[PDB]
């Protein structure tokens, strides 16, 4: 449900932050 969709949002954000770390 909602909490799973938010969890997926947080994992998407984790990938953005890693991409920012390395750019």
Residue numbers of the site for its own copies (CB under 8 A)?
1-4, 6-11, 13-18, 20-21
Write down how long the chain is. Answer: 23
20: DSSP letter = H
Cβ-proximal residue to ligand [N+], closest one: 1
Number of Cβ atoms within 10 Å of the Cβ of 4: 8
Q: How far is CA 12 from CA 4, 8, 17, 22, in A?
A: 12, 6, 9, 16
Pick one of 5, 15, 16, 19: the residue that binds ligand [N+] (CB under 6 A).
Answer: 5
Minimum separation from the CB atom of position 21 to ligand [N+] (A): 4
Which residues of this protein are in contact with ligand [N+], per CB under 6 A? Answer: 1-3, 5, 8-9, 21
């Amino acid at each position: 449900g909602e909490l799973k969709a938010i969890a997926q949002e947080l994992k998407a954000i984790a990938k953005e932050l890693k991409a920012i770390a390395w750019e």
